[PDB]
Design a binder for this molecule. Structure first.
Ligand SMILES: [Zn+2]
Lengths: 23, 214, 97, 63, 127, 49
RNA sequence: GGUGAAAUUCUUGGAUUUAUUGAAGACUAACUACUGCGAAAGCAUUUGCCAAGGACGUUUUCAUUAAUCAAGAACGAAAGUUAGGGGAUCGAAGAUGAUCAGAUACCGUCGUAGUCUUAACCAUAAACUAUGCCGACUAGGGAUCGGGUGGUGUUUUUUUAAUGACCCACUCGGCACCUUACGAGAAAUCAAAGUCUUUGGGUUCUGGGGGGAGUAUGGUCGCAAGGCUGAAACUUAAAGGAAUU
């Protein structure tokens, strides 16, 4: 819920979506 | 199972020869038995001595003169100037808020090959009849003060065979020479040398060491 | 809301003050913000000095003091130092002890 | 077996979590002029003698 | 008239050293410490253990010959507390009240001119 | 390892592999030393060499 | 040693402590301030060099050359990325001791990467005074810098001092401010947040209930991490600001 760890969670699942999409 | 204080001889610590008290204290050494002479262990022993105790007066209480045991001549253990320093809580009492500290440091030589680093501290005095609550000096005034101090500390050197410097540090005369050489710029209270180091020494010269007796 | 006209701080005319470590917490805090207080004390406590002097050499016993500026962070200070969190009235009173 | 008898000259509130200990100032009957601060347990009036098994160590409050 | 030494009272938190040395500091006369005298720690830099240490080193100092002692009270220094421990004010006075002569009291806490990074962290000890 | 076992102490096998330790003794005879002679250690270190 | 208490930890092959040195890499304590400079970020040892910059003074000069600014640019903490040095201290990760019901956290001891440095990137921060800039008017004290007067003040000696500096009083110009208050604001409050239903000095940027969401998508830049721009479907009657009990 902390607007930092919220942001980090979004920024992690974005990076893991980049690595999924590079395939 | 030893208690080696049985085999520990006391030796005669003399402080030649400019200071009034030519006798300071007694340092114990492991007894000079097989293959290890006392000299080897008692050479280079830096004994700090408070200049209050070394000259009796309480006006010399904010000063420590390091003395290294250097010579022996038929069991005669005499020291020589190794360094002067201020007391850790007079230095700190002179530092105060609403002032300006000035630190001059010069890596000078002497007449003899003694590479001495002389420091010096000088604080700004709020002059009598002042309603302004601080005595802050300008950067230009401090640059000008450091210059004045630096060339005085170097003028009182090339003379000053470290012996003559010792005999001119004790009577507070560099302090009251810099006072009048800076008063033309800023009041400047508490001018002291504060510290002297021996960064490097010449070759021994036991004549130069022993001329400090009799 | 904004609690202080300052910021529990001084920084006005400056961009960034070089920080200072809290004496007990070790927490780094900007110098201007850090609660500074000079701890000036006699080397020997105010109970021992009788037996100190009577058993000391050198009569007149100079008795040198000790000086060290304690820098405290805000939380370490709130532990019953001179802070005693005061009313929104008495917050503004700058006058020391 | 040296135990030192010392009369109290003034009592100074009470230390401890509770008021179980009373901080007191004593004067040593033997070799007097020596004033030392000390802790007691039981009720203390003035002029009362305490028996110290150590004359040396001083006293602090029991936070 | 009196043979001298150096007291070197290193009173930190967590322990007190009453390490009496020679004038020069080359030779150790006695190095009794606070934790030596109580084997149930909880309290190593305490006034009581410091007094006990001071009494032992002083008694030894009387046996070995030295009569008076200069005192060099010392905190941790470095980047830590830099304030003398609670056993510093015990170790001194206890040196005197044992019967040793004391003098030239001066604090030699090694203060850093422009320090390194202190132990802990940005937020420091959290508790 | 890519040779036949005649040619080298690493040869042969139905896979290319050394099969035994490549760290050979200092006292290994002139003819036996292939791999890492008197290897005080092996592998890639962390931080500084 | 280190602790609220301890344990990991090293120690008699003398650890910790003491002293004489030496090395290495960071760091500029105290002075240090309701003080300074800078476009912001930032910048506190010393000396020298190189350029710059405001302020003041000015009976110098040019004479509207200006204000703010899509696009377009330069600088831009920390962390982070390349590759070389460097690696002392401290310390993401990790090892490990405690606590715990569990605690791969808070506390303890170690500890890679980590930058401190050279070159090249990145371009975001509660990057904050959460207050765009240029301009005018409305009402006590210090203090920084420059200048003007005054003191028969101190120091000044080389004869009286030519002075000069420091200091004192009055005075302005600009500065970082602060203390009391008729106007303003939902109030907290304030030198501008005043001159605002008695509404217009110039000008740039931004917002239109809360979420979804700074998310998807498409371009753009970047070695990567990411940065810039940036939606909708659907959902909901509140969410929020300030003060009071
Ligand atoms: Zn703190």
């Amino acid at each position: 819920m902390r607007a930092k760890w919220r942001k980090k969670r979004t920024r992690r699942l974005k990076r893991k979506r980049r690595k999924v999409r590079a395939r | 199972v030893v208690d080696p204080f049985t085999r520990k001889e006391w030796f005669d610590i003399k402080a030649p020869s400019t200071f009034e008290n030519r006798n300071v204290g007694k340092t114990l050494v492991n007894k000079s038995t097989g293959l290890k002479n006392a000299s080897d262990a008692l050479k280079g022993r830096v004994v700090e001595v408070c200049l209050a105790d070394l000259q009796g007066s309480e006006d010399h209480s904010f000063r420590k003169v390091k003395l290294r045991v250097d010579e022996v001549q038929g069991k005669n253990l005499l020291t020589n100037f190794h360094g002067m320093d201020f007391t850790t809580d007079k230095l700190r009492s002179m530092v105060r808020k609403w002032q300006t500290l000035i630190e001059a440091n010069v890596t000078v030589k002497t007449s003899d090959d003694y590479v001495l680093r002389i420091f010096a501290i000088a604080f700004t005095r709020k002059q009598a009849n002042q309603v302004k609550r601080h005595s802050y000096a300008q950067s230009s005034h401090i640059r000008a003060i450091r210059k004045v101090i630096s060339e005085i500390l170097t003028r009182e050197v090339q003379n000053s065979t470290l012996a003559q410097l010792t005999s001119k540090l004790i009577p507070e005369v560099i302090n009251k020479e810099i006072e009048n050489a800076t008063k033309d710029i800023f009041p400047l209270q508490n001018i002291h040398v504060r510290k002297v180091k021996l960064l490097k020494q010449p070759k021994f010269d036991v004549g130069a060491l022993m001329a400090l007796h009799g | 809301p904004k609690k202080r006209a300052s910021n529990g701080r001084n920084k006005k005319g400056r961009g960034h003050v070089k920080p200072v470590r809290c004496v007990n917490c070790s927490k780094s805090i900007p110098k201007d913000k850090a609660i500074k207080r000079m701890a000036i004390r006699n080397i020997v406590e105010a109970a021992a000095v009788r037996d100190l002097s009577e058993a000391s050499v050198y009569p007149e016993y100079a008795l040198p003091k000790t000086y060290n500026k304690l820098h405290y962070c805000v939380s370490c200070a709130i532990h019953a130092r001179i802070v005693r969190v005061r009313s929104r009235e008495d917050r503004k009173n700058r006058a020391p002890p | 077996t040296p135990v030192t008898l010392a009369k109290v000259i003034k009592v100074l509130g009470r230390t401890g979590s509770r008021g179980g200990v009373t901080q007191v100032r004593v004067e040593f009957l033997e070799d007097t002029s020596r004033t030392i601060v000390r802790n007691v347990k039981g009720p203390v009036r003035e002029n009362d003698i305490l028996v110290l098994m150590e004359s040396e160590r001083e006293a602090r409050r029991l936070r | 008239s009196q043979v001298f030494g150096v007291a070197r009272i290193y009173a930190s938190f967590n322990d007190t050293f009453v390490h009496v040395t020679d004038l020069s500091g080359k030779e150790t006369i006695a190095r009794v410490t606070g934790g030596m005298k109580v084997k149930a720690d909880r309290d190593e830099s305490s006034p009581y253990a410091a007094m006990l240490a001071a009494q032992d080193v002083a008694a030894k100092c009387k046996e070995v010959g030295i009569t008076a002692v200069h005192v060099k009270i010392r905190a941790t220094g470095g980047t830590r507390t830099k304030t003398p421990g609670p056993g510093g004010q015990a170790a001194l006075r206890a040196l005197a009240r044992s019967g040793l002569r004391i003098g030239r009291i001066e604090d030699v806490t090694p203060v850093p001119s422009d320090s390194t990074r202190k132990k802990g962290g940005r937020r420091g000890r959290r508790l | 390892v890519a040779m036949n076992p005649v040619d080298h102490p690493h040869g042969g096998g139905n896979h290319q592999h050394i099969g035994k330790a490549s760290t050979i003794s200092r006292g290994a005879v002139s003819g036996q030393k292939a791999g890492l002679i008197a290897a005080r250690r092996t592998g890639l270190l962390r931080g500084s060499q």
